[PDB]
Amino acid sequence: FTKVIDEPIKSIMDGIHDGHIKKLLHQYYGDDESKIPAVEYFGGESPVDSAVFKATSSTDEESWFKALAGSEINWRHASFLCSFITQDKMFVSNPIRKVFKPSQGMVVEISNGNTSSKTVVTLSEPVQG
Amino acid sequence: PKLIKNKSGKIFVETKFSKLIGRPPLLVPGMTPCTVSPDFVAATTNAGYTIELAGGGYFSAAGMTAAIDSVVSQIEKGSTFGINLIYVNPFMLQWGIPLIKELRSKGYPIQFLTIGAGVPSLEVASEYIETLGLKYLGLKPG
C-alpha cells in the first residue's frame, strides 16, 4: 500500500479515517449523517435542575464527582471529571476537582442543572460555625 | 464500532481507544529512525493523530529532553504525544524512566509510554503505572 511519495501525513491518516467513516455510514447509519449522535466534546472516558449534595467522612469520591458533573456532556462534566487541565502548554491536576474533594461539612448546591449555559454550582462550608 | 460527532461537527470513529483519547483510533508507532525526528512527531500530532517519539534514536536524557522540548514548541496548546522505549537495552530504560517521571512532574504533555521489544515484569509495570503518572501504558506483546 506504500506507493505515493511525499503524501502529507495528514492526508494519509485522514484518508484512512474517512474511509472508515464512509464505510461505517453506509453500513450502519443508512448513509445519513443526521443519524450520528452529537456530544459537546469527544474524549476523556475511561475504558473501564436544582439539587443539594452533602459530604461525609465516607462519601465515595468517584460517585461524588459523578453527581457533581451530571449526565450531559458539557463544561460542568469536564470541570468535575477531567483529570488534568491545560496550562500554557503543560498538564496539571484539575484544580476544580481538588477544591471540591468531599469532606465532612461540605454542601454543594447545584442550580439550573438542565440548562448548562446558566448552571451555577455553589459550594458552602462551615465557616465560623 | 460507532460514529459520533462533536459540537464543531467533526465526525469521529467511536471506539474504546478513541473514546479514551478523544482522537481517531489510529496511531503511528514509535519507529527508530522514522519517529526519532521531532519535526515528524509534531506534524503527526498537529494533524490530529497519535504518535510515539522513538527513544531508540537518543542515547542520553539530555538529547531526548532537547527533542521533547522541540516537539512541545512545535505543537499547539493542548496537544499531546507519547514516547517509545525499547526494553532490551537496560541503559535506555535506566536513563529514560526517570526522565519521563521528571518531565511528567514538571507537567510535560506526555500522554503515554509504549514499551517495545518485550513486556516488563509485573513489578516494573506496577512501578511504571504508579510513578510515571501517565494516562495509559502501551505494550507490544510478541
The resolution, in angstroms to one decimal, equals 2.1
Q: What is the CATH number of domain A50-129?
A: 3.30.1120.100
| Helix/strand/coil (H/E/C) assignment for every residue in chain A | CCCCCCCCHHHHHHHHHHHHHHHHHHHHCCCCHHHCCECCCCCCCCCCCCEEEECCCCCCHHHHHHHHHCCCCCHHHHHHHCCEEECCCCEEECHHHHHCCCCCCCEEEEECCCCHHHCEEEEECCCCC
Q: What is the DSSP letter of B7?
A: T
What determination technique applies here?
cryo-EM
Could A37 and B18 be called an inter-chain contact, meaning their C-beta atoms sit closer than 8 Å?
A: no
Nearest by CB to residue B6, choosing from A28, A40, A46, is A40
Could B6 and A44 be called an inter-chain contact, meaning their C-beta atoms sit closer than 8 Å?
A: no
For residue A124, list its beta bridge partners.
Answer: A107
Nearest CA in chain A to B110: A91
B75-98 as b/e: b if 16+ CB within 10 A: beeebbbbbbbbbeeeebbebbbe
Rounded to a whole number of angstroms, the distance from the CA of A29 to the nearest CA of chain B is 9
**Half-sphere exposure (CA, 13 Å, Cβ side) for B129?**
11
Output the nine-digit C-alpha cell for B56. 531508540
C-alpha angle B44/B3/A44, rounded to 5°?
A: 60
Residues B26, B44 contacting (CB under 8 angstroms): no
